[PDB]
Amino acid sequence: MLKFLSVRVEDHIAVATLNHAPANAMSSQVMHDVTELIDQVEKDDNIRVVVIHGEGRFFSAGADIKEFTSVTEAKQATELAQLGQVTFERVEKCSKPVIAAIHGAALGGGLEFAMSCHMRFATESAKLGLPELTLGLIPGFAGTQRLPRYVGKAKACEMMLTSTPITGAEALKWGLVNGVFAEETFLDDTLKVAKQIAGKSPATARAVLELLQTTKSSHYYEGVQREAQIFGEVFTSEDGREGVAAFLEKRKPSFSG
Template sequence: MKAIEHIRLKVEGAIAIITIDHPPVNALSMQTMAELHEVLTEIEQKKEVKVVLLRGNEKLFVAGADLYELLKTETNEEAYKMSKLGHELMDRIENFPIPVIALVEGACLGGGLELAMACHIRIAKDNAIFGLPEITLGIIPGAGGTQRLPKLIESSKAIEMILTGRRISAGDAKNLGLVLDVYSEESFEQEAFSLANNIADKGKVAITSALKAIQAGLHHSEQEGFEVEANLFGLCCTTNDKQEGISAFLNKRKAKFEDR
């Protein structure tokens, strides 16, 4: 592994901020994906972190895959390997043990949208643009776009976006349910950290358990989801945080969770 060049990590208390900074368009190259893996591993080792914010630089989120890498990819085997590397990263983010929130500014296209869709929550600045334009390049989305978009928004709209490569605004993305909310330039940063802090105020055992139960229900049968939920509910009920949370509620005070 080369030294990390395109990813910056900053930890502020219980919040980890991952910034993708790969000028000029934050292309999601194979190196960038490998660096994201490395940073995620580092975050997993930080017990104090409860929320991850994933963002691009100050101009855009991610404008797509590295087209120069794609241009050099000429065999079925090479392309298949590239696609599977993308799947591996997106699956890791989707199943990350703590919530990952995508902060989308500017272009969120192709691999950028696939990356954002793998995150648990997406919020957007009002200048954000979303799309899967791969079809205009003679290819299709290869890092999960054809699978996740029809699950996140109405399937016919997803099919239309994929088959035409049409881009949509932040407002349209909110109306379709692709993003949680849209904020202005002035309030975007504050709202992002407000959401992250609201989650980080809770106990880590409950946060990770809730996320795991949600993912079980989304990706397995309803009965399997119920079973995972019951087991994790049982785990949470053995924690000090459960005692503190209920005691604080009954005594009308703010809970002070210790993540145990």
């Protein structure tokens, strides 16, 4: 039993429910639970597919702002960025297909999690985005590398620099999700997909997943290293401290370079 993830297996499908009330923030503990889920999924021969969704209104609204306050320093910040990067690389490397079922919102760290899953389905009105620059920070869980490789460099640029999220319907247009389903049947419609996948032989599922990883170049991996380093730098900068303080104080930050 994991603290913020509950898992129920039915017909070789592990349905994992993220439950870190009220917005399912990707805290350090949740990351540990994610790594444990992937370990469990990889060892259980009965499990052929995993579907991940959020409890409550949201898939996941972000990383946990409580771990990024004034009390945290630059080395811990780089390390926290790297914990999310490592965790989400474990998800993406999972030998069993992992589907993110998104309703409500997947923002920031939450979208970075979803992005590391092999497939995503969303409701039409779900909000997907990377609003980290509102805090004077950058995405630090590989979002700067994953997002442009989904939606292209230009859209990714716009989404990061404006911080504005896009709807599930728009994310479909831009290739950030696989498909949209109605809110009423959304989890069930995603489970239908999982059930089709569960019918295929494990060795072929594994093979497809492996062969899909060839787009992860050494330029990609070095980008992820760079992102973690930059994250720590901006985090401890005057502008990064101000951005985070402004958010907590419900005011518009003032950046000075």
